């Protein structure tokens, strides 16, 4: 049973291959987008994971797209995350921070100055984000049409990722995961659907990948390549952002470039919750031969599917999302073949301890 064997993930050694996927839970304090001791307890409960990957976390105030999502840009955010990572370490866990900029998947009412959010191009996401009502409860609101970033603004985006990585290292995270998936800002540049630019950041796949590779380079230089992972969702459609008409070839180009940086891991989000066609074995093989770090697979996995693909040498670890929401001791449950707790989806987003810290261990 390879799932319960160790794995070196860049600078860290995970004791098992059962990872906690990044899960937005929208329970942070406003004003200030501040993580809380409740969040600290939730992560501490899950510290037996081979690796915890945190909820997506803003690199800056401009990055915010969801009310209740935390940041890693302010002194008060850094101080709060320091307590959270210390708690995970006291339980012998390891924790990466997933860092995002939401780009156009946002609303003006939560942006600095109440202005339109930014993106590769001035195209509405045509979906909804989560705000809070006057009682502090989560509500789904249509996205605001973004403004296209000017060329002279792109270095500031890269610097915001760099600074957020400095902050993450200071805050005690073991690794960083760049959120280059699911229709957020980096994916908005990668995708020809959302990126209609005609400068060096749009058009060719090389230009579409330019921003994410500049970010990768900047964060590797700020910390170390063996502390950097990246999440991609490069096959299919995620939150209305497709991967264009040459999605496999474009994915392999990006993966070959990422491999050159010697980063710690590639995390592939294979499907959204509504499902879609499975990755082909041939595509998995093409990814594996191009990337020489850890590959994490995610998206409706079972322990059996994970074991199959680990045993075939195609991936190294699996990230579970909803099963980690509901099972703090998922590792022990999978190892013992125990039943899993029933999930309560109504409390995934927003609220308090109920549906968050009240799922029991075995």
Ligand X SMILES: Cc1cc2nc3c(=O)[nH]c(=O)nc-3n(C[C@H](O)[C@H](O)[C@H](O)COP(=O)(O)O)c2cc1C
Q: Is 359 a catalytic residue?
A: no
Distance CA 215, CA 146 (A): 21
Torsion of Cα atoms, 268 then 24 then 28 then 14, to 10°: -50
Residue 89 labeled ligand binder: no
Binding of residue 211 to ligand X (CB under 6 A): no
Residue 350 bridge partners (DSSP): none
Distance CA 49, CA 106 (A): 31
Q: Please report, for residues 140, 355, 358, the alpha-carbon distance to residue 344 in angstroms, rounded to integers and kept in the order given.
A: 18, 6, 11
Binding of residue 182 to ligand X (CB under 6 A): yes
Q: Which of 10, 22, 70, 172 binds ligand X (CB under 6 A)?
A: 22
Annotated catalytic residue within 184, 324, 349, 359: 184
Binding of residue 239 to ligand X (CB under 6 A): no
Q: In the chain, at which residue ranges do the beta strands (DSSP E only) sit?
A: 7-9, 12-14, 18-20, 52-58, 95-100, 118-119, 128-132, 138-142, 147-148, 175-180, 228-232, 265-269, 294-298, 317-320
Stretch that binds ligand X, among 204-212, 216-224, 285-293, 318-326 (CB under 6 A): 318-326
Residues 6+ apart with CB under 8 A from 70: 28, 33, 34, 35, 39, 55, 57, 58, 77, 80, 81
Determine the size of the site formed for ligand X (CB under 6 A). Answer: 21
Stretch that binds ligand X, among 134-142, 218-226, 243-251, 315-323 (CB under 6 A): 315-323
Nearer Cβ to ligand X (147/322): 322
Q: Which of 179, 187, 208, 210 binds ligand X (CB under 6 A)?
A: 179
Nearer Cβ to ligand X (274/282): 274
Distance CA 319, CA 52 (A): 9
Residue 8 bridge partners (DSSP): 13
Nearer Cβ to ligand X (178/211): 178
Residue 147 labeled ligand binder: no
Stretch that binds ligand X, among 44-52, 101-109, 296-304, 330-338 (CB under 6 A): 296-304
Over the window 89 to 108, marking each residue x when it contacts ligand X by CB under 6 A and - when it does not, the resulting string is ---------x----------
Binding of residue 350 to ligand X (CB under 6 A): no
Binding of residue 56 to ligand X (CB under 6 A): yes
Residue 98 labeled ligand binder: yes
Residue 73 labeled ligand binder: no
Residues 6+ apart with CB under 8 A from 69: 24, 26, 28, 33, 55, 56, 57, 58
For residue 113, the minimal CB distance to ligand X (Å) is 25
Q: Which residues are catalytic?
A: 184
Write out the binding residues for progesterone: 140, 179, 182
């Amino acid at each position: 049973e390879k799932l319960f064997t160790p794995l070196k993930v860049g600078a860290v050694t995970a004791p098992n291959r059962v990872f906690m996927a990044p899960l937005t839970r929208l329970r942070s304090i406003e004003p200030g987008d501040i993580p809380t001791p409740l969040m600290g307890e939730y992560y501490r409960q899950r510290a037996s994971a081979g690796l915890i990957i945190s909820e997506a976390t803003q690199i800056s105030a401009q990055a915010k797209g969801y009310a209740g999502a935390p940041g890693l840009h302010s002194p008060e955010q850094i101080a709060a995350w320091k307590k959270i990572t210390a708690g995970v370490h006291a339980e012998d866990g390891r924790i990466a921070v997933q860092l995002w900029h939401t780009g156009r998947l946002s609303h003006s009412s939560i942006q600095p100055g109440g202005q339109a959010p930014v993106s590769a191009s001035a195209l509405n996401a045509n979906t909804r984000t989560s705000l809070r009502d006057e009682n502090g409860n989560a509500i789904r609101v249509d996205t605001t049409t973004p403004r296209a970033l000017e060329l002279d603004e792109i270095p500031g985006i890269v610097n915001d990722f760099r600074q957020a990585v400095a902050n993450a290292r200071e805050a005690g995270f073991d690794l960083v995961e760049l959120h280059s998936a699911h229709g957020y800002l980096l994916h908005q540049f990668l995708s020809p659907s959302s990126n209609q630019r005609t400068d060096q950041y749009g058009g060719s796949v090389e230009n579409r990948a330019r921003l994410v590779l500049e970010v990768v380079d900047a964060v590797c230089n700020e910390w170390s390549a063996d502390r950097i992972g990246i999440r991609v969702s490069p096959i299919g459609t995620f939150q209305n952002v497709d991967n264009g008409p040459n999605e496999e070839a474009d994915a392999l180009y990006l993966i070959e470039e990422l491999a050159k940086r010697g980063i710690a891991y590639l995390h592939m989000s294979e499907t959204d919750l509504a499902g879609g066609k499975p990755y082909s074995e041939a595509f998995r093989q093409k990814v594996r031969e191009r990337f020489h770090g850890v590959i994490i697979g995610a998206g409706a996995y079972t322990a059996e599917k994970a074991e199959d693909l680990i045993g075939k040498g195609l991936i190294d670890a699996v990230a579970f999302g909803r099963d980690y929401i509901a099972n703090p001791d998922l590792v022990a449950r999978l190892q013992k073949k125990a039943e899993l707790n029933p999930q309560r989806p109504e409390s995934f987003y927003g609220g308090g301890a109920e549906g968050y810290t009240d799922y029991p261990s075995l």
